[PDB]
Amino acid sequence: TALDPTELRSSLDKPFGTNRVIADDAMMADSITPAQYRYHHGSRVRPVNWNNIVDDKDLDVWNRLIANFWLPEKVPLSNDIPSWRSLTDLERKTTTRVFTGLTLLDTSQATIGELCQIEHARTEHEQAIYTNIAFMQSIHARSYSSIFSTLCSSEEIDEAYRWAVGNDVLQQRVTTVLCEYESEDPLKRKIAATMLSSLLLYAGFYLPLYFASRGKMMNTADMIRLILRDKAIHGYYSGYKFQRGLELRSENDKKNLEKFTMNLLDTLYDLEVEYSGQIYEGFDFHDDVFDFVRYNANKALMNLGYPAKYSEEETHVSPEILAALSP
Amino acid sequence: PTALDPTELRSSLDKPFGTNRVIADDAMMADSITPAQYRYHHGSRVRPVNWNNIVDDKDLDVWNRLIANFWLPEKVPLSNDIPSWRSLTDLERKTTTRVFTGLTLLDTSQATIGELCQIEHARTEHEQAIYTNIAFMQSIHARSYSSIFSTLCSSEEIDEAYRWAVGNDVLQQRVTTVLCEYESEDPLKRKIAATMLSSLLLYAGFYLPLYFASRGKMMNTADMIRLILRDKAIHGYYSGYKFQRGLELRSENDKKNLEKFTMNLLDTLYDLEVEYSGQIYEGFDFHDDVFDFVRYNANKALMNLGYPAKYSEEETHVSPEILAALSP
């Protein structure tokens, strides 16, 4: 039926009774998580039970992500102020723009991208993990503003955010991902999330890693490595859960999901060349940036269980950038 | 399941953005949107969160306080309550495990959908980030009841309590009543429900560990409960604050609808609390004090939404021992 705006939406459903029983095995098996309720009105909803782990990997990932909790306030970013001032004008402008673009991807993952993975999650503990990951992705996004607050003028921050809104290719990149989060196929959401965490930010992460390899912006680099410590697990876990859902799908669906994955990757790679090629046009490390992009694209594919797409020659990251990845 | 070929990107259905790069003028910035709003505004430009452009100072204050209050159940020495737990009666232990499993169900719901559905129609981008912290901390709350069970309970006791919760019709009616409102397209109905969850629905359960602490029992568990209460008091205040920020931009028609809806939801949830917690606490002499405490917190939920109190001082007189237990 229809509903008056003052009435409760649950009045459209059959009420549960007032019976109390100790649920038997069938009643427990038919119970569902709260995020599934909207598809199954009248089903019984089950609280999370951390003393009944279904996949031991979930407990390990939960414990590790929580133990890695950090805040940008704990990094002495203000000790980068002399280094920041020693950069060129172009270096400072490029940093603010790159980091504002990274903010846009992490904002997207925090506020919808990671959350849209909950309703079709394989386990209730995995659902709780996505709530931690989304909060930490809000921390990642917030931390780029922490950098700007320490180093930048209001005018610099203002122009960088206007540049981001006004950058058509950046808009194409983020909206490409956001559309897949709406997919009716839960595994396409997981593929997109794995791409965000294991690929889409790395052309940007190249810049602070480059600064660190040159001895600059050293404290900022520590924070970037805290972000990377999170994202490496985020992307591994997204891809692991994709593979656990994939093994239950039909052969035809597996073929289509692999084709879709390569279509998504190829589209996002071409967009990265367009976007970061233009951003880095006044820098002589163009070729190394895309070796590094392809290097991380292979990791994203491996996280999904697919073979590497790019060759050793196409993924040869300079040894100074790889050294800057570790503390 | 749509008719788009499964290998195609869903963005292929939309006109792509161009290849222009401009410094967005004020009109372009005003029309930009948060990522969570993109779903029903395809083609709009999406904007990254700017913590150096705070729209509502209250958002920065709430964010900073909630993050400062981060805690984990592993830091509470719950195992020091094992002697106190074993000094209780079997009925007290069974009642506690069941009550906490019912609290787990409400926090599980809020963590995994209830708080997260507040993001898409949030007033500010910083508020959206705050909801991600709140949802995570609600997962911590739900997790923390399992931490209690792992410390105090046998495998059989935990298993039976989860079966009790799934099989408790009234508990199911309570949770699904809230879950249904989170499906409304009216963001303020979502906000009212979240305010009720954080400021009312768990308090008949919280009464029990406060009662034990007032009798000198389960003292370390009480500390953890106070950590949970320290979060929920802000969660409920903030949900109600944001409701009022949205409410003041609504028509007189919608204001009248939302006030009646609020009282309908409260009245329904209250009656269900009487049925649910009245049955659970039937064997205890504090039964009537529980509902003074329920009505006391119902008044706080209403006050958080900006509405007048419903219950009188005589209907909300919580015993001084329970109120003292709320403090360290």
Residue numbers in the entry:
A (entry chain B): 7 to 333
B (entry chain A): 6 to 333
From the paper:
The discovery of a metal-free R2 defined the new RNR subclass Ie.
Of the 364 amino acids, residues 6 to 333 could be modelled in the electron density. The N-terminus is extended and contacts the second monomer of the dimer, creating a large interaction surface of about 4300 Å2 and forming 6 salt bridges between the monomers. Residues Y150, H146, H240 and D112 are in the same position as in other R2bs. The position of Mn1 is occupied by the ε-ammonium group of K237 and in the position of Mn2 a well-defined water is bound.
